[PDB]
Amino acid sequence: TDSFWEVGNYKRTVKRIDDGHRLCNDLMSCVQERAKIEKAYAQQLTDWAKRWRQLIEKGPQYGSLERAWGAMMTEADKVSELHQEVKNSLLNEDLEKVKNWQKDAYHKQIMGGFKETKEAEDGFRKAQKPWAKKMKELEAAKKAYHLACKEERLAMTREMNSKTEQSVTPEQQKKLVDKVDKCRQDVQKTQEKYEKVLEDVGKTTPQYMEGMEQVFEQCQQFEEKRLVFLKEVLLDIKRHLNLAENSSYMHVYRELEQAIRGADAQEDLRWFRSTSGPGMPMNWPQFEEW
């Protein structure tokens, strides 16, 4: 069946070691693609900010409303910075951290594979060998034992519906019941052999179970180390993705509301009156000769 205890089925466990390395590559690339995404948003915000400052300042909008409107470009510049930081953390801290763990947990052979995958193969293989050899022995003896049963059986049937018929000549057929007899002794011999192997298997089962467990437990401890470390890395990442971990993000919009609240219509109005309105100076008529 698929039981772990059947010869060969330990490979699922060996395989989990190779899978762990791959999962590290997958995670690394995954965060890597997320940093591109964050970088792209920042840059677009940065361009808008640059674009609309130029477009606004170049007249005609004047006064504290230009100032209030332009405070928005600043918020685009500041949130842009925060998202660049998310990128810098993802790449310089989290990715490198996985990267270094990897190179220390998994060492590579010139052939191809990993030291660590190979080390669990050899442990499992070594622990199963006595067992496997006994299992080939058992199946053969069972075959041999059953082969005899079937035969001696034929010799049996080939007797009742046999002798009672024609040639029950003694000078011939007494040596016939001696075929059935010969089978008797044959089933016995093979039966005893089969039971012997079966007894061998019994007494070496504890050792088989002990040895396979020691290796399994080494594998679980290797995986636990991977799981504990990954958990800590996900946490590192969540912190970095979260612009609300601290309150710089909240200050951006507080700053923004203040700038808008500061702007006054009347000031913009009074200023126009002096530079373009009645407040402007004038040289009223007066007497003029040479």
């Binding site: 395989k15 190779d18 899978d19 390395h21 590559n25 997958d26 191809g112 594979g113 990993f114 995958t117």
Partner: protein
């Protein structure tokens, strides 16, 4: 383009190639939507494999 196997991979289909870690293949094309590539071992088994089982 050349490709080097990172892990052992068992064929789960007739068009799904099999190899050992360390063995080397030839990429016949680019991945698809799922992560599968068309490849070829030496004289000369042809089949699909997963791209994340390979490096440079």
């Amino acid at each position: 383009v050349r490709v080097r196997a990172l892990y052992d991979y068992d064929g789960q289909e007739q068009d799904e190639l099999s190899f050992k870690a360390g063995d080397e293949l030839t990429k016949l094309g680019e991945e698809d939507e799922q992560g599968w590539c068309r490849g070829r071992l030496d004289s000369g088994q042809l089949g699909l494999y997963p791209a994340n089982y390979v490096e440079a």
